Symmetry: none
Subunit: 111 residues, 2 copies
């Protein structure tokens, strides 16, 4: 019923941020019309406010960015992938709870 204000990545900027800059972040691979993605979106927007510059919160549209989707061998949507220092650190799928995402952020920031 609504809008999403996460920064939308194409392959290039994904490469820049996750690989070149080694940004500590999460990336939701999603589709525009996905009902579950629509439930997960607000949870990530709310979390972004808690970690403003310390951790990135990005979005990849898998219909536009098919190469990236397939780079990760992903087979469903929504999925949230976690990165720090250019490494792929973790992944969760489906209707996540903020507890789960928060713990992963903390696990990631710590290594």
């Amino acid at each position: 019923s609504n809008a999403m204000s996460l920064e939308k990545l194409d392959t290039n900027t994904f490469e820049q941020l996750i690989y070149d800059e080694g940004k500590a972040c999460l990336v939701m691979f999603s589709r525009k019309n996905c009902h579950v993605c629509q439930k997960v979106t607000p949870v990530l927007e709310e979390l972004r406010l808690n970690y403003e510059e310390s951790f990135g919160f990005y979005y990849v549209d898998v219909e536009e960015e098919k190469t990236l989707f397939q780079r990760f061998s992903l087979k469903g949507v929504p999925q949230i992938l976690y990165f720090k220092d250019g490494e792929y650190k973790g992944k969760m799928a489906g209707d996540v709870e903020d507890d789960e995402v928060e713990q992963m952020i903390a696990d990631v920031l710590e290594d």
Copy 2:
């Protein structure tokens, strides 16, 4: 970040709807890597047009209700207007030829 004039909801309505301004509006957010790439494309282009064609921006955190109206998925998005019509949009990173071509289609 340079020439791009920031609009609040009130001014966005006055220009686009009450006055029918021909313009583009970049919907954006602070600390946005992709926004940082898109802004200089628009600033460079701006030089090629008279002030009759607006180049504007809106901060989605400040103009929440406005942004929600269009139910956009992701930032940045650039939306194009003329004579009070909403001519269309493009989303995420853009090249200058996409913007130029859209501007020409809007103006014709």
